[PDB]
Amino acid sequence: GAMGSMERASLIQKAKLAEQAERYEDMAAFMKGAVEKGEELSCEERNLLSVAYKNVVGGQRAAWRVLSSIEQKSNEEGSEEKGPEVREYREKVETELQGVCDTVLGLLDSHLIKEAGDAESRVFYLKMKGDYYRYLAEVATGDDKKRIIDSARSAYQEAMDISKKEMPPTNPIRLGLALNFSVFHYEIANSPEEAISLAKTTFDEAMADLHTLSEDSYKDSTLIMQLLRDNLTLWT
């Protein structure tokens, strides 16, 4: 890898600079380099990894949606035939997105998840695994689509099982996992009732535990609780 000659600490330093400069492709490359040094990541370092790739893949997903919408209108009744270009360029963006997802899943499999023994790190990485299989599922159409969906489900479920046993209901990782697994149910698994039930139960159980928290923990937890509520409002 092109980052093999840079110090781990220098990679982390430059990832933070890239974030400040909104250079998220660079940030992701720096953090990939840091993961490949082979040491476990701290909480702050896990957050840098997540932020970098979330921004990269988020932009790809937005672009894919623009192009997929144009392509679908191109195939409506009365649309003028315009050649292969829209499909080709949608496929180009799609292939780049799949490549990023495969890269992230590769980092989790080699070897972040297997070395993660603490509940907070293990749940964080398994949530990420669910998330990046979910992004692969958003664009999947072939023989392995159901298996891609189940790979997302299985990662999220393992993360949920650990988080329920080992973390309080207000823990931001537990909350963000539940938020995203709820979206998985609604948008990927065609299970809106499960999505709504999960979001509501997560919100209510967190509400009942807020009284245990400091002001700073309360701010962290209620931020994600508001995202649960926002989704419930969209869906009901």
Binding site: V183, Y186, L234
Partner: peptide, 5 residues
């Protein structure tokens, strides 16, 4: 689009 983190 629903919220995810």
């Amino acid at each position: 689009f629903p919220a995810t983190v």
